Design a protein around this nucleic acid. Sequence first.
RNA 1: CCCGAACGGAAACAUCUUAGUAGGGGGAGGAAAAGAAAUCAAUUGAGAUCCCCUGAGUAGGGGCGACCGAAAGGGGGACAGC
RNA 2: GAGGUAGAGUACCAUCCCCUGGUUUGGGGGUGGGAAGUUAGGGGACACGUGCCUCUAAGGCUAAAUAUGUCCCGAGACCGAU
RNA 3: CCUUUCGUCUUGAAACACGGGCCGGGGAGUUCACAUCAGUGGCGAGCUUAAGGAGAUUAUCUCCGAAGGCAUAGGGAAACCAAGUGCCCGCAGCCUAGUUUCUAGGCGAGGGGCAGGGUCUGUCAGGGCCUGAAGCCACUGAUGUGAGGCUAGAAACCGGGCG
RNA 4: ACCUCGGACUAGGGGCAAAAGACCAAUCUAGCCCGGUGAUAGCUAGUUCCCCCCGAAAUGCGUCCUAGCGCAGCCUCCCUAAAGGCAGCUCGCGGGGUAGAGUGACAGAUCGGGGGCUCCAGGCGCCUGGGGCUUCCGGUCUAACUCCGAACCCACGAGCGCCGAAGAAGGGGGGAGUGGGUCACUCGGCGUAAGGUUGGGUGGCAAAAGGGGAACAACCCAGACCUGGGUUAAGGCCCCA
RNA 5: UACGGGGGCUAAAUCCUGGCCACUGGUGGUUGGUUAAAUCCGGGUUCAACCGGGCGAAGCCCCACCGAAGGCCGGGGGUACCCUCUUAAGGUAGCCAAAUGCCUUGCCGGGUAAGUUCCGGCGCGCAUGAAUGGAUCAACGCGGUCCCUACUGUCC
RNA 6: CCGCAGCCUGGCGUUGUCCCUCGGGCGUUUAUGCGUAGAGUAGGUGGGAGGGGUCGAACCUGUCCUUUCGGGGGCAGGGGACCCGAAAGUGAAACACCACCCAUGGACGCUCGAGGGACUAACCUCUCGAAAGAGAGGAACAACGUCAGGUGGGCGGUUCGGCUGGGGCGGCACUCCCGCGAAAAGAUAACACGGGAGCCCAAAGGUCGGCUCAGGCGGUACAGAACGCCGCCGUAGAGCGCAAGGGCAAAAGCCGGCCUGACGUGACCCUUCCAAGUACGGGGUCACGACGCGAAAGCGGGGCCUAGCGAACGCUCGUGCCCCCACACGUGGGGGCCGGGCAUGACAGAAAAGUUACCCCGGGGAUAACAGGGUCGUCGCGGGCGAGAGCUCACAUCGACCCCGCGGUUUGCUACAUCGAUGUCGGCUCUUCCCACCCUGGAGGUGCAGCUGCCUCCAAGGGUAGGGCUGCCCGCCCGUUAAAGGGGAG
RNA 7: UGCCCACCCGGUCAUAGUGAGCGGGUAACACCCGGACUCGUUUCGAACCCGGAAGUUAAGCCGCUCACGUCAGAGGGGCCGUGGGAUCCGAGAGGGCCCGCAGCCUCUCUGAGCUGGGAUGG
RNA 8: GCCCGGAUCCGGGCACCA
Length: 92
Amino acid sequence: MKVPKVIKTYCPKCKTHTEHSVSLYKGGKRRSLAEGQRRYERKNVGYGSKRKPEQKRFAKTTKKQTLVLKCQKCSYTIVKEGMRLKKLELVE
RNA sequence: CCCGAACGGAAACAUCUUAGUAGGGGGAGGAAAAGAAAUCAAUUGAGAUCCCCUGAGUAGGGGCGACCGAAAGGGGGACAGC
RNA sequence: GAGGUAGAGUACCAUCCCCUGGUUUGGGGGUGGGAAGUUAGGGGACACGUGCCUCUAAGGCUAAAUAUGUCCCGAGACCGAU
RNA sequence: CCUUUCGUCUUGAAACACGGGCCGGGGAGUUCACAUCAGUGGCGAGCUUAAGGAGAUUAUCUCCGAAGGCAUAGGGAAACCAAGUGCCCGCAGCCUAGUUUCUAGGCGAGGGGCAGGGUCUGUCAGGGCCUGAAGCCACUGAUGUGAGGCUAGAAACCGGGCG
RNA sequence: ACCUCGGACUAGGGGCAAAAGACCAAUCUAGCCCGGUGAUAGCUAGUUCCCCCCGAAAUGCGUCCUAGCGCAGCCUCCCUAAAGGCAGCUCGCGGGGUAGAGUGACAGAUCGGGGGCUCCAGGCGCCUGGGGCUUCCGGUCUAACUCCGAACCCACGAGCGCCGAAGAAGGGGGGAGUGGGUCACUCGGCGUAAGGUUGGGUGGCAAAAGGGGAACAACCCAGACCUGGGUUAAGGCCCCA
RNA sequence: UACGGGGGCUAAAUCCUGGCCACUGGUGGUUGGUUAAAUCCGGGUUCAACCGGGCGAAGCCCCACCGAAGGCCGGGGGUACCCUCUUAAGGUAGCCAAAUGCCUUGCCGGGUAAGUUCCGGCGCGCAUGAAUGGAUCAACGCGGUCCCUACUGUCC
RNA sequence: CCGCAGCCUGGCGUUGUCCCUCGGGCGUUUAUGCGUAGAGUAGGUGGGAGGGGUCGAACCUGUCCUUUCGGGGGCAGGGGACCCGAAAGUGAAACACCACCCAUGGACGCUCGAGGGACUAACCUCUCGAAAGAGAGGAACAACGUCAGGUGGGCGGUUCGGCUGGGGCGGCACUCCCGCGAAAAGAUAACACGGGAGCCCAAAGGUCGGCUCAGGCGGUACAGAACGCCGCCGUAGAGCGCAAGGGCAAAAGCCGGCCUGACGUGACCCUUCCAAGUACGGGGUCACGACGCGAAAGCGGGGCCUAGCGAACGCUCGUGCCCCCACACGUGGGGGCCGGGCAUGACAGAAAAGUUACCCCGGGGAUAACAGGGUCGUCGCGGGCGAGAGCUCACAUCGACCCCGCGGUUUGCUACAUCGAUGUCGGCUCUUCCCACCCUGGAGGUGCAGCUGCCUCCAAGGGUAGGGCUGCCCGCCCGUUAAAGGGGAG
RNA sequence: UGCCCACCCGGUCAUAGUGAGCGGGUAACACCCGGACUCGUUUCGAACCCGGAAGUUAAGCCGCUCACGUCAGAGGGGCCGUGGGAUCCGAGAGGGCCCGCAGCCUCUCUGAGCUGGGAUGG
RNA sequence: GCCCGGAUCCGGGCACCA
């Protein structure tokens, strides 16, 4: 599905409708020193079995496509709810 | 004082718990061990160790699941120091 | 008033393992590195800096308050020959 | 004249379903801890002592010991902030009149409905929790949970020894 | 590679095996003794005195769940509260697409005739046969058809009827059991059927004696506090009786 | 102390032991890719934790060899012969209705008055075949089976 | 599914002395440079038209090194002194000099490594020695300790889903949507029937305007049933992303214009889930803030309506602040509240393969095999009808296509009884019964001359044997016989 | 006056509809005449929009007749269901009786526009 | 998510606890 690069929606910081630049969401690096990564490493020291459950059965084939909209006057960003699609063709 | 499980529970089970238990080896005494702050807590206070009632299933640990778990302080018993 | 003394493979650091409520913070052990030493060291829940507060590790000894019951005395809404 | 063999699982079973020769004796919901309800008792914006100390006719008894706990303020992750009053119905009961006989009329504690007040969140209406002054202790019983846990019953797994 | 005796060595996740999982003190797909240990059991068996009052469920959803549990429904006990409640009927006002009935009202199926048009084949422009379209007339059907449409069932208001200040709408609290059902009548789905299997409604049994059906959980009569007298129901009246 | 110690498979002798290295496994090699801790460099942090980069062993990816290593030994089209695909090749010598053949009491012969068993031959071999050992019986058997003679209370 | 030994390899330690080489760096040292247009080697940024010139130049003649032998770079003498342009070309010019960069090689002092070689005194092996000690060989490797990667059923712990006309194999009736089952309110089951979803669309979404669809008829060149034009009819016979059902005509369809309401925050209600508890998901109605389209009322938090989706913990992003300790303040770093994404299809969410005929325990008649019960499709037998054949003639005899029944001797279907046991094939031995009659007895018909046949009715008193083959039962076969019937009794 | 007849805005949404033929207007409703201007045709003043007024009852509109459509009433014909009951019938499928309720189709005949709010005509 | 090679995709070896 095709989506424009620029969309005019409500900027809640500016309190009016402004232009936004559209991009797809992408996550960051896992960042060792996160509290749940410090705890996992503390659990893997010593002897034992595999410590934690790991997923093996997979059913879905797509992923929810999320749109990221940045207000072009104040850089305020609104993140929208995702929707299961193949690959959002963001070309204008 | 060292070495050190499984059954069982988690309605399965492996981290976990059971449990530093059961058991094994070494060393005493009429009691042992600990014991005179490189301690606690907080506007500059207390004052060696041990035991009882509490603080308290609190802080906190945990497939943050089942479950596990203090200390300071308060009240007492005895209350030495070299 | 001036000068002298104060415990080393020890404290601590990285890593591995076991304990622990100890969690980026606690304890012990194995392996490697390894101080300062009074113009010094340690501590005050991640790490460091500056004040402030507090203590002196790495050498021993130490009654009383308590744990037990082979044994001796006494007691009892204990049993009464399956 | 009327009447199939007891207990049991089970739709029924129930008997060609299982346990059952006779008699005597033994033989299975118990204890503790916490929590919550109930029946009663004591004190009441408070209640209650624990460990313990002193005395004594010495495991009883008497005096002392509120440390702590529960309740009295709640909301919020936290920094932080912090109530308890005014309207309407109206049961019992009381008063007035008739007691003809009584929602006829007033007043109405407890109870119900609308609001108000504290706090978090939202940009207002909103949404969550709280606030209209009763609890603590004791004895007994019931149930839940934890310990063997109504009584009996596995195949197994582990530690140390003996052949 | 013969048979046999005395001594000795190998020990339990270990030994020894000319190999069968054989043998290791009547024990071996992992010996025995004592301890952990009264291991755990959603499973099986047993669970001890009398009277009185009330009185179920075998259903829905979730669950490594269907031999078990949680949340609801149904039983019992207590406190409160203070005037209405609804298991039944009638009237009024509304909802519905089932039995039936239709097919020229949609969608599918389905049997014959008459007229008109066309092509092909045969016979001597005509006749006969087959095919396609149109038109008119009659006939057969539908769980997944409807231009229609009952009996019947249901919502609300009023009235009647019954319960209620003695036995009490709404609120609060304590304790459960139950989650294997089964048959008869009746309306169905699957099946050649079945004392089959799976649904809706009513009733027994379960948890219900007694009277009838020869005897009979379930069918018909009927709900047993005890003792005596009477009248009936179902059923019966030749003998058993 | 290799005419040895250790480890496999087959099973005396006689006649023999075919084709295939694609897969798995073993052994060896390497232009090259990836590759942990430690160390080194840059950033960051008054120090650390933390981010990057470089270097990076064995193994793996890649190549070759090995069938008395585990093993495997088909189909289609055309005229015994040639081409193609699975996945490398396409059952050689022999043997058979086998202690291995579903159909099945296969078909023909022998033996019996009469033979689903037995013997011989055949070979549409569901699903025979070569040390996973093929064919083969001299001697031996408290091994399995069929036939004859003798003998009999096994039977009438 | 995982662990742990053993093995292989690397770092650190025990671990030491002499070298040599190579690769990095640090402060230095230097000399080397042709996409094309052109006096010709523009590699680039600038000061810089002046720079060199007894403050010794352009020029002939050779030794020599090199290169895409293009051509430039350095040699002293013969020359006692000359050339580039400010002028001609280049998306970028001056061999006018000087600087840095890209880029070649070598050398100084220092550091880091990496590799190779040698040595002996650690360490190891052997010999002699009662020991003390001595000798020989190897050697900083091996070996051992510790950490890291690989391999690793050698050994240990475990898991090996469910429903289900027994279990298994199959299927998915295991999450969701439409019709029917379903009995005109609501609720309602089947391994019942007919099918679908796990997405697609920046327009296929919002609004405003204009228009009318499938199909048919008349007239027109190519023109044809079906191109464009002019007229007539047309209740929908079209289209509306996708299953099925419902809805829709100055539209919800077709064609255009302008847009992004497929919007930020916060509530309530319906359905999933009847009355009567209940997570997600989906939908509906709004408040505040801001937009779009319309003259306007207004319509618009996606698609005409009913499917297209997912907990805790963990990670991550968005968004404004709150907190960090036995004291206070500061920096880095962590944690918190509110919303989005990463997924569990067994879809109200575990991280998971077989095998046992060597097997074991607790149970189950809630559930299979033998046997009993119910049913009779299958199996065996009877009746009706009469196509036909029998020279003619349906019924002496046979009897198609269909229709109505019986038995309980086959095989199925069901799961009522037995799972703390009712000994499960065949044969032998012995007893009895049924009749649907094979022989023996009676009667009749005939396509009955006699003999022999064929058929119908009564009748169960008596009989129904011996062998070969196979475990059989059935069956085939041999020689006879009056005939060598067929069934039941757990 | 009047009442009803058109017109504007409606309610009911076929008893109200569709086709054909005919009747009727000096006002009203229309066709009609024309385009400078507001506006306009992916060409066309056809349509929309603006400005007008000679002509006409031929269209539309209203009324009447006739054909079919539709809603009812009456009559002839085809088909037929159901709530409660019984030791009613029958081997069953089904059927009869008692108390309580109906329905659908097809022919033939007869009718068929009502109505609320406001400015022109009779 | 990486490296690397090959035409955003593909291949090889390693990273990856809802």
